[model samples]
Target: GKITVFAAASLTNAMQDIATQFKKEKGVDVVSSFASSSTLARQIEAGAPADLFISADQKWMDYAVDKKAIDTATRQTLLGNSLVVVAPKASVQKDFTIDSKTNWTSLLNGGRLAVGDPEHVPAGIYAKEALQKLGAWDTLSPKLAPAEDVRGALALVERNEAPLGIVYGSDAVASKGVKVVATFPEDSHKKVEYPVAVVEGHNNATVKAFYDYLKGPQAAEIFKRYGFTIK
Candidate 1:
């Protein structure tokens, strides 16, 4: 049987590439479910048969560990990422500067601010933290367009519906017509740590081999290429 894994939405590009390589190298079929980390956890708690759980943030991983679905001692921080403030490449050709000098509040142009739903999305939580750091969280609350997931927020930026959007660095690099205007200052939000662990009831041999491969050079290289830190 194939090893089933559940991962975060922000990891879409890297995970897809890694899964393909994983199958070819290990001769084991791999299947994955991608969503906001919180949502994936709730599914696991409801008895989803995932062999491994990959969380976008620490909070959700901790929750899974608390529920005994994840081995607390085996929990590992696999990768780290940055938050990017982006705009469509076609509209903003200038430095795409947004700082204390720019009137970001007025630039919304009466359109909704695209963000993932904070209740379930890690990207949304990071976005909220950045706005709070910039002192714009309250000002932008009313104009928000909460998405079911992070990719939906990226879609908004691609269509130019939302002049500005927040997503992971990988998303900005992959999406055409969308470019990063600026990166949120590190101090502005929490570190984007990706956590992974083997699920409690799934110690099948095939699943164990796939999990080990994720820590090997083949997969580590993909992480490095996607702007993630191996440490």
Candidate 2:
């Protein structure tokens, strides 16, 4: 049976590659849908028939567990990530630390800063938290081009629609059109976590096999190669 997996946009590259390997080995097809964690969770809550759900943050996963979206017994934190400021590949911006001393205005340079919608997207939530901690929220908030998901934010920078963007380190690694210009300190926000779980009514043997495969060593290597930290 095929597995329908719903994952965060940031996991696009890695998960698709892993799905390929899994199909080659077990011959089971994998159908993946990538979007913001909040959107996926809401879809699952609305009975989207996804076999699995992987969220970029525990907030959405917890929301699922607290509701009827997914099976709690299958839930687990699976990965970790870092946040970075990304600019177009040809940008002159250099690597730096994101902090209170950072000049948010100078970095944007009269252009909008691309990021996921801080209202719900996991990447955007962490971005807002980091900026808030650095006291740069007020300075940069007005200049934000809030996208629906992290990839959408990255796309803005990729297409030069935005001068700078905030996204996961993995996302920067996945795209060739953007370069990381700065990093948000680990302490700037809540830990960047990815939690995976089987969606409601999808805990059969085949589903569990795929879940275990995701947690296996081969998948770990793929995740690391894609710039994710094993959790």
Candidate 3:
């Protein structure tokens, strides 16, 4: 059987690359499930059979640890990311900027702004924080379209269903249908961090080995190639 990994959706491309390389090197199958970190954590709490969990933020990892779904001692901060505003590749916009004095409502051009569900998803939370800090939240709240995950939000823009979307920097880089319009200022929101850990009672050698492999140089390079920041 393959080692099962439940990870945040934003890690899809990079994790897939790492898993393929790992399989080639070790002859071990790595099966991964990607979704919102909160969703993955909830599934693990409900007794899902995941050998490893990689959360897009510390909150979900803390949720899993609080529920004893993962081993606390094995938890490690793995990567960092930034938030970006993106639009469909076909859009005519260029060099968009966001700041305190900008009118975000006008930027929407009467179209809905897509974002991950700020109430739970980390990407959304970061977006909300940035918008709030820039004084755009109250005015733009009514026009927001909340998606299940960061990729879901990105999809809305990719399909032209939403004119703009907020997502992680890695997501915009990996996506072909969307182009980054603006990157949120570093001080606009909390630092985006990814944390990983072995599931409790799943401390088998295979799981531990894969966990270590994720922290190795090859994996670091893969993550960086996908626009993630190595810690």
Give the winner by TM-score: 2 or 3.
Answer: 2
Q: After superposing candidate 3, which stretches have Cα over 4 Å from the reference?
A: none
Q: Write the per-residue lDDT of candidate 1 for residues 23-117, one digit (tens) a residue.
A: 77767777888888999988888889898999989999988888888866667899888888778889753444444455566667777778888
Candidate 2 C-alpha lDDT tens digits along 93-122? 887767689888877789999999999999
Which of 1 and 2 is ahead in lDDT?
A: 2
State TM-scores per candidate: 0.93, 0.98, 0.97
What is the alpha-carbon lDDT for the whole of candidate 2?
Answer: 0.94
lDDT of each: 0.82, 0.94, 0.93
Return whichever of 1 and 3 wins on TM-score.
3
Which 10 consecutive residues of model 1 have the lowest summed lDDT?
92-101
Give stretches of model 1 more than 4 Å off. 96-102
Best by TM-score: 2
User: Which tens-of-lDDT digit does each residue in 104-167 have in candidate 3?
Assistant: 7777889999999999999998999999999989998899999999999999999999999999
